[PDB]
Amino acid sequence: ETKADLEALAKDLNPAVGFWDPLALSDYSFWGTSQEATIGFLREAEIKHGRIAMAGFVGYIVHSNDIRWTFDKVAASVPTGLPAPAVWDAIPDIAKWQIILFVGVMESWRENKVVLEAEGQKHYMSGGKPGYFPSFDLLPHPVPFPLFDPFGISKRATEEKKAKGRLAEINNGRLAMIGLFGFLSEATVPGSVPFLKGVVPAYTGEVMAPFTQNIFTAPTAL
Amino acid sequence: SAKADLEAFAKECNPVVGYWDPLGLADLPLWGQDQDAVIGWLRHSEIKHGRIAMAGFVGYIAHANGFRFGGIGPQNVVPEGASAPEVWDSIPFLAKLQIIGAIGVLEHISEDKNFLAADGMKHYMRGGKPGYFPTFSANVHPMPLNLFDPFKWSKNASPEKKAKGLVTETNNGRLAMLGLFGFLSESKIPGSVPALSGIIPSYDGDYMQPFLPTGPDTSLWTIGNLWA
Amino acid sequence: ALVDSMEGVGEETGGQIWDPLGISEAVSDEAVMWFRASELKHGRVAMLASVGYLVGAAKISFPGELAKGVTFASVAANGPYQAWDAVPQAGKLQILSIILALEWATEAKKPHYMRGGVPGKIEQLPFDGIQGLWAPKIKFWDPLNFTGALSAEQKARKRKAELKNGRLAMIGIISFITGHNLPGSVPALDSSF
Amino acid sequence: VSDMEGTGPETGGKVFDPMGLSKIASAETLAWYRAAELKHSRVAMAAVTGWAWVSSGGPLFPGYLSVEQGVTFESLGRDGYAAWAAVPEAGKFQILGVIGILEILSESAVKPHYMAGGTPGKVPLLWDPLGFTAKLSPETLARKRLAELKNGRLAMIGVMSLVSAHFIPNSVPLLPGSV
Amino acid sequence: PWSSSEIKDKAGLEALAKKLNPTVGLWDPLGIAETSPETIGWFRHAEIKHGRVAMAAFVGYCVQSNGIHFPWNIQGWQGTPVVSFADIAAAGGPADQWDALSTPAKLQILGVIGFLEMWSETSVVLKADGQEHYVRGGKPGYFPKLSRSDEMAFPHPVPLNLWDPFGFTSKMTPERKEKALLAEVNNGRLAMIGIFGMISA
Numbered sequence A: 001e002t003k004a005d006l007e008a009l010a011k012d013l014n015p016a017v018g019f020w021d022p023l024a025l026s027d028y029s030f031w032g033t034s035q036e037a038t039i040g041f042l043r044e045a046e047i048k049h050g051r052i053a054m055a056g057f058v059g060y061i062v063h064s065n066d067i068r069w070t071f072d073k074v075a076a077s078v079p080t081g082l083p084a085p086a087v088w089d090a091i092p093d094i095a096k097w098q099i100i101l102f103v104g105v106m107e108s109w110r111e112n113k114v115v116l117e118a119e120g121q122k123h124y125m126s127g128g129k130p131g132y133f134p135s136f137d138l139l140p141h142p143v144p145f146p147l148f149d150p151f152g153i154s155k156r157a158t159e160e161k162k163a164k165g166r167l168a169e170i171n172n173g174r175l176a177m178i179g180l181f182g183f184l185s186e187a188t189v190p191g192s193v194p195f196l197k198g199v200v201p202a203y204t205g206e207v208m209a210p211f212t213q214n215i216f217t218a219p220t221a222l
Numbered sequence B: 001s002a003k004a005d006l007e008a009f010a011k012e013c014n015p016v017v018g019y020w021d022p023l024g025l026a027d028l029p030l031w032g033q034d035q036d037a038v039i040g041w042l043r044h045s046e047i048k049h050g051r052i053a054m055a056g057f058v059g060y061i062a063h064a065n066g067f068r069f070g071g072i073g074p075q076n077v078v079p080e081g082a083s084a085p086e087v088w089d090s091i092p093f094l095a096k097l098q099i100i101g102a103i104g105v106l107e108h109i110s111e112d113k114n115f116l117a118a119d120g121m122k123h124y125m126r127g128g129k130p131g132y133f134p135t136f137s138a139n140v141h142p143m144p145l146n147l148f149d150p151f152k153w154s155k156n157a158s159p160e161k162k163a164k165g166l167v168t169e170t171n172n173g174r175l176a177m178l179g180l181f182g183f184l185s186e187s188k189i190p191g192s193v194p195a196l197s198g199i200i201p202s203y204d205g206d207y208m209q210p211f212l213p214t215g216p217d218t219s220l221w222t223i224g225n226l227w228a
Numbered sequence C: 001a002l003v004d005s006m007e008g009v010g011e012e013t014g015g016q017i018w019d020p021l022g023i024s025e026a027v028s029d030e031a032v033m034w035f036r037a038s039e040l041k042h043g044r045v046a047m048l049a050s051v052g053y054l055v056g057a058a059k060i061s062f063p064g065e066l067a068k069g070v071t072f073a074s075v076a077a078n079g080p081y082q083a084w085d086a087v088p089q090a091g092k093l094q095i096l097s098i099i100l101a102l103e104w105a106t107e108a109k110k111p112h113y114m115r116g117g118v119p120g121k122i123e124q125l126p127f128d129g130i131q132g133l134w135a136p137k138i139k140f141w142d143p144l145n146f147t148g149a150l151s152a153e154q155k156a157r158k159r160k161a162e163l164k165n166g167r168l169a170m171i172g173i174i175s176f177i178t179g180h181n182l183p184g185s186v187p188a189l190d191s192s193f
Numbered sequence D: 001v002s003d004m005e006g007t008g009p010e011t012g013g014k015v016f017d018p019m020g021l022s023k024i025a026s027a028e029t030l031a032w033y034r035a036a037e038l039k040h041s042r043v044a045m046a047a048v049t050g051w052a053w054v055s056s057g058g059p060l061f062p063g064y065l066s067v068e069q070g071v072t073f074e075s076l077g078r079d080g081y082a083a084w085a086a087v088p089e090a091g092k093f094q095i096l097g098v099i100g101i102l103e104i105l106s107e108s109a110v111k112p113h114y115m116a117g118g119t120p121g122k123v124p125l126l127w128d129p130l131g132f133t134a135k136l137s138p139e140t141l142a143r144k145r146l147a148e149l150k151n152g153r154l155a156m157i158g159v160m161s162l163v164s165a166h167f168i169p170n171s172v173p174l175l176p177g178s179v
Numbered sequence E: 001p002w003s004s005s006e007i008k009d010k011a012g013l014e015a016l017a018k019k020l021n022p023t024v025g026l027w028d029p030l031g032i033a034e035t036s037p038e039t040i041g042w043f044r045h046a047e048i049k050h051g052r053v054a055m056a057a058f059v060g061y062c063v064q065s066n067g068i069h070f071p072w073n074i075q076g077w078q079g080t081p082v083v084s085f086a087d088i089a090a091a092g093g094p095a096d097q098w099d100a101l102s103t104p105a106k107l108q109i110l111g112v113i114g115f116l117e118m119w120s121e122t123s124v125v126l127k128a129d130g131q132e133h134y135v136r137g138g139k140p141g142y143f144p145k146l147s148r149s150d151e152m153a154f155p156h157p158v159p160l161n162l163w164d165p166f167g168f169t170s171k172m173t174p175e176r177k178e179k180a181l182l183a184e185v186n187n188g189r190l191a192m193i194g195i196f197g198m199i200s201a
């Protein structure tokens, strides 16, 4: 998308705030590629981070209140009452490494030229749709559902509703990237979020440290 | 179109509700097969589940209340007063195996191209009637009676009546599915089917393991029991 | 260039030649045929070796005795890693001797893959046409001749599958060996490796 | 595969192939399949007949199997895998070597090898030394070949029933718990 | 898209507001009149349904506080313990009476209430009848008939309908129905404040 398209998108997301890039990432040519592709990468980054942060907000609320799956042994193995950041550290590293590799397979599926062009879209940097996820039609083996709408809902949605939904996606993502980080910052830095004092359990570890044992130095195996 | 036919069938099943596919399973391309094949599979699964659940409900009433054939056979190792979950657990291991194997032979005949072609029909995923068990007209050795309508009570029944009967079959099969798992659920998560509370006894044992407990290893054959 | 015609481009890299270093563009076609022959050789060796490592780690061994004094399970009772030593000297000598014979024959066939030959299509009947040597006409590739039931399009699809599976196996075999050497290197590998 | 023999009335009137290995098989691959089927058939028929005769009170051969070592036919117990275990290793090697010579012969002597044309399972040396089936009609010969295959399929299931009985007691009903 | 005369704008809301009361008019500080037609219909039907439930709850509260209990036995026919409506009345005030009600009785009552709710919400039933869903241009509050002979009829015949089982409306005049709707909205609001007052007390 062009910077004019970004201005229009910003003025539709929030008419009053409008286009509010004060650091000019929209202008810096990333890897030497054109502005129309840096805009695509930046917009895909915004959508993706907002997605992961919205999911992370809901997941943090779920983990802090120990609403766990009833019929699994890993959840039972993890002690109860831990902070939500620690509910991640108390897991077998082999499960962390499979969550991460699941996201890896999915983000390899997404960026694939062949799947995207078979379904009709292109890469987000090649003028495609930022925040699209191709279905598993060209998958080696069959699979029951896709990722976006595994069921049928929004197979018959108007383009107006889709545009409204993408605007709401971007806005809610911008807000959730701040809410989830409010949770993390209040956990690891007490009195950092003034309104959550005494609400978020405290935490000592590093939320940017996925595995307990350092993979770069000494991993663990199963 | 197969989805159009399925939608009309849903209206016939219940016109107030109509077609209710909340997951889009009709639209999903199972195995990569087209929508017609997928809908054929899904419909066949629906009638198969419903049929087996109806038979299971009547069998639950038969076994739990006490309804046994007399004489030598599997029923003589089941303790009297045993629960419906305990009857299957108490019949001999070979009895369980031969029940499941006979059902397997019936399923194999049901999806065999041989019998369906001898009856001038095709597989339910390739332009056939979903839920049609063929006649045993290719079983090498002739068999006296067919599975569906063995005495041929419906040899002259109207196509409209047959369609309405299939509409009834789907509905009653769905309802019998719900009732049979009501029985199963009341025995392992009590207070879940309110009416069944106090009626269905608790059962400690995996329903979905067919062969656990394996049951007795008795030899009930008497004359010519050289295998014992 | 000969690079544009070969198989090996798949949907994973966007249906494009995966050469970040550009050596395929740099070197000549002759070196490219060498590289494809070596690729398929490594890939096939690795598709053998990976399943061999799986079988050894499962400790699935033939019923019998390799030598007259050691059992197939006795050799395999120390994992795949410490197995080649436990194999008797004569057995691995014979294995490597037949491998030497196959390598020499495949290289000695006249239409060499570099000098005007199909890369990776090592001749299906080695040891034939050698003066003063007779061996049974056991077709090296597909002696049961499953290829006869496949058209050229199916052969191309299966060659693409061959290259992709070979690449995955080359990754997997080194994954197994590294998992044994460095204990935590590859997750999802148990202590048997 | 539709042209090849084996499709009696016992599986419709059609080929039995759930997995569909015949679909993969070319003409020479089908020739290999039929040759292997026939060899398994014949070895299994011999094996099951011998096991039945030895373990069903049949008359063991007279005299000593090995006069030098003292091993006798009667000393070899009428039990599967015990008679073979007690047979001298030299005798085992005799049987295996004669079989190996015969099989290299059946591979090198047939000229259009079952693989390159030919007829699977044809071994002219051993069949009918007295010529018992040298004046039968071609149909009758086809019917008898179909009978051969059908008998052998049963025989190769039976020999494995015997084997799995010894290695897993009480596997087969209507068979002794030991062997 | 809407295809009816149902209120879909602050102008229509103001018209209905002066109709129900010329004095107050439209009292919308939160500005939920500044919404889409579908949301306006949703708010209208929500107000109507709160009116229904509040009026029923207030009259039930009055009767139960007066103590006009039922003369029957509530349990103890199919081999269960015996409980009487006199016992339920002696349990306490209306909330205590509800608490004293047995659990499956509560479940069955709530199930019937949900059944009526879904018969209301089912668009196919209203369109077999003369209406649509209140969000897509339907009259807020119309209960479809439970007695019918159409294809959308129960497998067993139902004797009567929920609203007007014997035609006590009969033929109320074509606009005095709207008059009664106005009176109903006002009485529903009054009963709403009243029942919350009794609960608070």
Ligand SMILES: CC(=O)O[C@H]1CC(C)(C)C(=C=C/C(C)=C/C=C/C(C)=C/C=C/C=C(C)/C=C/C=C(\C)C(=O)C[C@@]23O[C@]2(C)C[C@@H](O)CC3(C)C)[C@](C)(O)C1
Pocket: A054, A055, A057, A058, A154, A165, A172, A173, A175, A176, A178, A179, A180, A181, A182, A183, A193, A194, A195, A196
């Ligand atoms: C300290 C101070 O002073 O202040 C603050 C600081 C701080 C920390 C910021 C605070 C906070 C909390 C905040 C702001 C938290 C924000 C959290 C946020 C923003 C969380 C969004 C989740 C969205 C999800 C999961 C959406 C899924 C949506 C999905 C999966 C959909 O189905 C989309 C959908 O389109 C489809 C595909 C189909 C259409 O039919 C329509 C629908 C919608 C169904 C405090 C505590 O308040 C105080």
Ligand SMILES: CC(=O)O[C@H]1CC(C)(C)C(=C=C/C(C)=C/C=C/C(C)=C/C=C/C=C(C)/C=C/C=C(\C)C(=O)C[C@@]23O[C@]2(C)C[C@@H](O)CC3(C)C)[C@](C)(O)C1
Pocket: B069, B070, B071, B072, B073
């Ligand atoms: C596995 C095991 O251990 O099983 C055990 C347990 C088990 C199974 C419970 C057992 C049992 C009980 C069994 C099986 C009992 C069976 C009883 C049976 C079979 C009882 C028939 C009566 C028929 C009558 C009176 C018919 C009259 C019929 C009449 C009047 C006629 O003939 C009329 C007519 O035909 C003529 C003459 C010819 C024509 O001109 C005119 C017509 C057609 C009109 C056993 C035996 O204990 C074995």
Ligand SMILES: CC(=O)O[C@H]1CC(C)(C)C(=C=C/C(C)=C/C=C/C(C)=C/C=C/C=C(C)/C=C/C=C(\C)C(=O)C[C@@]23O[C@]2(C)C[C@@H](O)CC3(C)C)[C@](C)(O)C1
Pocket: D045, D046, D048, D049, D132, D133, D144, D151, D152, D154, D155, D157, D158, D159, D161, D172, D173, D174, D175
């Ligand atoms: C009850 C239960 O649970 O399981 C059951 C089933 C189960 C488990 C499978 C069992 C088994 C084993 C079984 C079924 C074994 C089967 C064995 C089998 C079927 C063995 C055939 C041999 C054929 C031979 C030697 C043919 C010679 C043929 C000769 C010498 C010829 O050439 C004849 C002939 O040349 C003449 C002389 C004249 C010519 O003109 C014509 C021809 C060419 C025709 C059990 C244990 O029994 C019990």
Ligand code: KC2
Pocket: A050, A051, A052, A054, A055, A129, A130, A131, A132, A133, A134, A147, A148, A161, A162, A163, A164, A165, A166, A168, A169, A172
């Ligand atoms: C956990 C992650 C996650 C969250 C929390 C989340 C939240 C929201 C919200 C927030 C309130 C709204 C309102 C919203 C709306 C839409 N989402 Mg979205 N979404 C997530 C994930 C995905 C994925 C994977 C895809 C996707 C899409 C769309 C489209 C389709 C537009 C179109 O088809 O034009 C619309 C309208 C698909 C796409 O293509 O987006 C461009 C797609 O692939 N979303 N999404």
Ligand code: KC2
Pocket: D065, D066, D067, D068, D069, D087, D088, D090, D091, D092, D094, D095, D098
């Ligand atoms: C089909 C297979 C087969 C063939 C075709 C075949 C042919 C001939 C011929 C050729 C005309 C001769 C002349 C010959 C002679 C002897 N055979 Mg022999 N034989 C076969 C099989 C067996 C087995 C299983 C055994 C055996 C034995 C002996 C002994 C005993 C020696 C001793 O007492 O030391 C002597 C003298 C036994 C044995 O070696 O026992 C240690 C023993 O168990 N053979 N055998």
Ligand SMILES: CC1=C(C#C/C(C)=C/C=C/C(C)=C/C=C/C=C(C)/C=C/C=C(C)/C=C/[C@@]23O[C@]2(C)C[C@@H](O)CC3(C)C)C(C)(C)C[C@H](O)C1
Pocket: B143, B145, B146, B147, B148, B149, B150, B223, B224, B225, B226, D174
């Ligand atoms: C009627 C009907 C149907 C049906 C049905 C049902 C439920 C059918 C059930 C059938 C069933 C359960 C059939 C068992 C047979 C057992 C046999 C043959 C055992 C033999 C045993 C033998 C031959 C043993 C012999 C020996 O030990 C002996 C005696 C002594 C020795 O001398 C020899 C040996 C050792 C070998 C359809 C078709 C499904 C649908 C249709 O709509 C209606």
